[PDB]
Symmetry: C2
């Protein structure tokens, strides 16, 4: 967790001054701003040592955790409904879930085969979608006009579950 | 707009069959699903010609339009409040706006100097932030525990307005 070699000198220096005596983890941390100032430039790499921030990661972050989201110019909602309601295309997986679940109903389309982001935007754009979310596992999720937000964080598209 | 050389053969072929006779732009487009099937693989590159989708872009998309958003593991809300309320750090620009404006109140921190995404996540993580949004202009926006969503789409951080 704590990087002793980098941080031992400066971190101890604050401790002698008696800063960073308050734990954020339970209750208010009155001293937190003061502790950060004493650390200064080393706060990002040493806040773990004083307990003010989480330890340097014990875990490998899934690629799916990142996603990149853009809102399409000039959405065409009528087109989006027409291709979804009817016998849906096999390459497309269609999910409707209640709107604001991710935080009437929100409908999204999950492309099957994994695709590049630039391809994903074009495919959503041809669909009339208001927005698209691109998972960094490369799963692509077009966002319907109804949906308030960016839609489900889940990588629900078949044939690209990589990262699970 | 329309790519005549790629699309003229197949697009005309649908027209003789009398598909793609319905405009999505105003009113319902009954024929839209049928038109897409006739186009098949060329729908992404030729939906513009039949009017079912927007013309290939006349505009250069700003880098800021893309952003990439991830939700931090183990947010520490008490830490985030402590460093924001008090005399804020100069490197940090702090914006509080009503919650659900982007779609009580949502508070975000806009880093001044432009930074890489990996740096942006670390800086937000040291801050206890629930989430961070990284603009592809490279502006970094930490997201407070209160905020429902990913916070303002605006690239409001000083000293990296590139793309405007």
């Amino acid at each position: 967790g704590c990087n002793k070699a980098l941080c031992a000198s400066d971190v101890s220096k604050c401790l002698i001054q008696e800063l960073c005596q308050c734990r954020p983890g339970e209750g208010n941390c009155s001293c937190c701003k003061e502790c950060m100032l004493c650390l200064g430039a080393l706060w990002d790499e040493c806040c773990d040592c004083v307990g003010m921030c989480n330890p340097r990661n014990y875990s490998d972050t899934p690629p799916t955790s990142k996603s990149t989201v853009e809102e399409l110019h000039e959405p065409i909602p009528s087109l989006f409904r027409a291709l979804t309601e009817g016998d849906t295309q096999l390459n497309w997986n269609i999910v409707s879930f209640p709107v604001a679940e991710e935080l009437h109903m929100c409908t999204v389309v999950y492309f099957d085969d994994c695709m590049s982001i630039h391809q994903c935007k074009i495919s959503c754009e041809s669909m009339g979608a208001s927005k698209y979310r691109w998972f960094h596992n490369a799963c692509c999720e077009c966002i319907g006009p109804e949906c308030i937000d960016y839609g489900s964080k889940t990588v629900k598209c078949m044939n690209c579950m990589f990262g699970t």
